[PDB]
Symmetry: D2
């Protein structure tokens, strides 16, 4: 399938830039008999570095030469039940500070990463700024109060987000947060898209 996608896209690119199995095979340094096979679905074992070259000689990226993520939907929908949520914990010196509960995700939209974040630290100073995402983010406060921080990791703007507050964080905009001072814990839904 990844092999079949490569086959169709290799052939198409080869054709759009006017190269016969001969030229491509030469330019790359293989036997026309080889490229032929690649286009016959036999690319399976080619390596990431080999694909690197093949894409070069064709003035393109490996991405243009490989099939799209795929379709994991059922009539346009995909459902995640709470009992099948993957869980990861942000621990520090063996103590939970955050727990990320991963919600439904789909290959038909890879930028979509929805999480339920349980914040187990109510000390604003424990907030550790993270560079910034390569995509926008939607936030929603489920429980407690959230002390949000954003901007210059050194000199940052602050906000006290009570339950029910919603926020929008532009991509590449650095941010960090804990639960409001002395309130114990908080809960927010974060949707990176």
């Amino acid at each position: 399938t990844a092999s079949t996608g490569f086959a169709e896209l290799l052939k198409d690119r080869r054709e759009q830039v006017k190269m016969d199995h001969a030229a491509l095979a030469s330019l790359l340094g293989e036997t026309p008999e080889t490229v032929a096979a690649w286009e016959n679905g036999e690319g399976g074992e080619l390596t990431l570095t080999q694909l690197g070259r093949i894409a070069h000689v064709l003035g393109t990226s490996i991405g243009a030469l490989t099939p799209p993520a795929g379709n994991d939907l059922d009539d346009g929908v995909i459902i995640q039940m709470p009992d099948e949520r993957p869980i990861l914990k942000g621990v520090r010196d063996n103590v939970d500070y955050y727990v990320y509960n991963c919600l439904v995700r789909t290959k038909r939209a890879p930028s979509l990463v929805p999480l339920v974040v349980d914040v187990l630290t109510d000390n604003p100073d424990d907030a550790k700024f993270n560079s910034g995402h390569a995509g926008n983010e939607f936030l929603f406060v489920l429980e407690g109060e959230i002390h949000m921080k954003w901007g210059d990791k050194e000199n940052p703007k602050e906000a006290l987000l009570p339950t029910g507050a919603s926020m929008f964080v532009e991509e590449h905009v650095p941010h960090a947060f804990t639960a409001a001072k002395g309130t114990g814990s908080a809960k927010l839904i974060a949707v990176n898209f």
Copy 2:
């Protein structure tokens, strides 16, 4: 500002397609003295139908000739407090069936429409299928249980989404929902993006 954006974009388009104030003015049927002014920021009062023509003669859309939505962010973020949420009610014969609570929205990402939907009907048959959105949707069950319906408005797939369930609805995929049978009401967060 909408007038200033039009000015810069009118001039740029005019130039990229090689037309002097003369040709454009003729082709459109105005005085070169007029187009000149338009490009001087004086387009303000032009009508939607006039802009329609101007964009035609330049082989483009009014969209390419008008500035982008704008920037309403504060250092890459925008915050909506719960007390400023706009509320709309889906009523039927004077009785609330749904209440939409609008969450933060931003011009820097117009496709983003997050809502908290209180479903006040627990009768699956009241589910009224809506064509489908021109964008994807992320759903999350906040309270109660949701009886989701999707696909053929006539013969549809059904799902019983307990609290904590998350769902993904591809765009143009028709859907509708009520709270699970006899449970009174439910709550879900819907994020159209």
Copy 3:
């Protein structure tokens, strides 16, 4: 239509953001009957400044509320004959320096602007220089020798013989004339 296109797109945006006729009308300082009319194809007279504000309250752009360029094709294609082509003169002091021949253009791809540029100046120092555009550009030398100048007035220079082709990335400023004392040159430039 601009009118019908607005009508359809306005209703969708409004319904999309959970605003009823009145909510929208309130924010706009209009009456709900007015808005309803707009969604009934009567927005034709709305000005650019009004649309600007409508888009603002709907948290989007005028473009997102207006219809696409349109379609001028014919089974996926459009053809322009050498007769039906506009001609623009890049004139200085009545002295023709550049003469652009506009090739086929289409709404289905507004960004495509193909041209045959006759350069009537063989004085490299006459190279005016623009500040690049928000599009890429492909060039091909048809006749003569081209004197290419890119980067920014201060710049790399190339003498392109006939049959030469080059790619100029968006926002990269450029200028050109025909090679020193050769009189004139010709090149086709396709901005996309």
Copy 4:
């Protein structure tokens, strides 16, 4: 590098989806030390089928995990001389029918494929016919008269004199030869 590019992009995707070395390793039936190595630039030998599965568990594509085409420019531009151009022959029975001259191409825009096509067939019935491509195409008649055929073998036909230009939308199938008995024609085609 493909290796380094993978390394950087894999780590971001993993961190992006809240998977630690072990979680990823579990789904892949690999060990956490392996994955860590990959994020350390040692993914070079991973096959296309393996990358395919890695992308699958990371709910994305191989492309989203691999680096962009790369950059071959030079201050926003790249130049090709008539000497440095590849030539491909569309041959049938040793009889040259079409000869394509490849013009300047760039990774910064892979989709751009400019060509000078010498058509050595004046027999319209020789018009082969392709099934359109996933890109748009601009054409210009350099020499001779072109016999255009579009739609699908069953089709609109146009006789393009010299200087004619046309736009062919993506997926719209086309074919062509030189006008009846005129020997040969020339046209530049730029797919983008």
